[PDB]
Amino acid sequence: MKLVIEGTIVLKTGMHIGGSSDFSAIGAVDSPVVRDTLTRLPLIPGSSLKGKMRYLLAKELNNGILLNEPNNDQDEILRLFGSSEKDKIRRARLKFNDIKLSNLAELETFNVSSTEVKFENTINRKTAVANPRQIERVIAGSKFDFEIFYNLDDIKEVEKDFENIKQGFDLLEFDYLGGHGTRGSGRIAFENLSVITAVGNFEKINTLNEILGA
């Protein structure tokens, strides 16, 4: 049995996942965002979303504090995100994916590009002189429909696993996703969080949807 976690990530503020900055043509923005190479669409890498969600969930699940290596997390964190220990190799039940933005047509309706350029400066305190800089951000209002695959390994802890998943999504809504988050960027929201069965049917899929919607 395998499950798919549908949903959308809505940018409340501009998001900036750091790009390569070595292949985005010549004369582009100073610090570009990561984009799909083919479609040039900005994307949220599955690695970055997974890492932020794992950090927030491991910090909140353990005691509110988190100082250990990723392999020394709780049993729930290890069974959801995997472990590479010597004699304890947990196979991750969650398979994250790269998330390209889908509402490019909606953004083009308002005659705005997917990405903006944010102008910032740092004012040297001993000189009171400003140092302007430019960064690229995916504009607020962009939507990123994602898909996360859940391996239903144990029927006895799928409810707890999905409670943890909903908790991690909630924690991400009170934090940022990548980039200069403390400086106003990266705030996201989750809605249309629905889990569906990849093949066949799951007899507790209605309970999973209501804990994933509330």
- Interface positions, 4-63, toward other proteins (CB under 8 A): 4, 18-30, 34, 36-40, 45-47, 50-51, 55
Q: Among other proteins, its own copies, none, what binds residue 166 when CB lies within 5 to 8 Å by partner kind?
A: none
Work out how close the CB of 153 gets to other proteins at its nearest, in angstroms, rounded to a whole number.
8
The DSSP secondary-structure symbol of 15 reads: B
In order of 11, 49, 78, 133, the CA distances from 96 in angstroms are 19, 8, 15, 33
| Integer Cα distance of 181 and 160 in angstroms | 30
CA 11 to chain centre: 11
Q: Is 10 left (phi over 0), alpha (psi -120 to 50) or beta?
A: beta
Q: Among its own copies, other proteins, none, what binds residue 189 when CB lies within 5 to 8 Å by partner kind?
A: none
Q: Residue 11, SS3?
A: strand
- Residue 109 is a binding residue for other proteins (CB under 8 A): yes
Q: Among other proteins, its own copies, none, what binds residue 27 when CB lies within 5 to 8 Å by partner kind?
A: other proteins
Work out how close the CB of 88 gets to its own copies at its nearest, in angstroms, rounded to a whole number.
10
Q: Among other proteins, its own copies, none, what binds residue 123 when CB lies within 5 to 8 Å by partner kind?
A: its own copies
For residue 58, what are the contacts with CB-CB under 8 A and spacing of at least 6?
66, 70, 73, 74, 77
In which element (H, E) is residue 3 found?
strand 2-11
Q: Interface with other proteins by CB under 8 A: which range of 1-9, 61-69, 164-172, 186-194?
A: 1-9
Work out how close the CB of 66 gets to other proteins at its nearest, in angstroms, rounded to a whole number.
25
Q: Among its own copies, other proteins, none, what binds residue 127 when CB lies within 5 to 8 Å by partner kind?
A: its own copies
User: Phi and psi (nearest 5°) for 71?
Assistant: -75, -15
For residue 71, what are the contacts with CB-CB under 8 A and spacing of at least 6?
78, 83, 84, 85
- Interface positions, 155-184, toward other proteins (CB under 8 A): none
Q: Which residues bind other proteins (CB under 8 A)?
A: 1-2, 4, 18-30, 34, 36-40, 45-47, 50-51, 55, 82, 84, 86-92, 94-99, 106, 109-111, 113, 117, 119, 132, 134, 149, 151, 153, 198-199
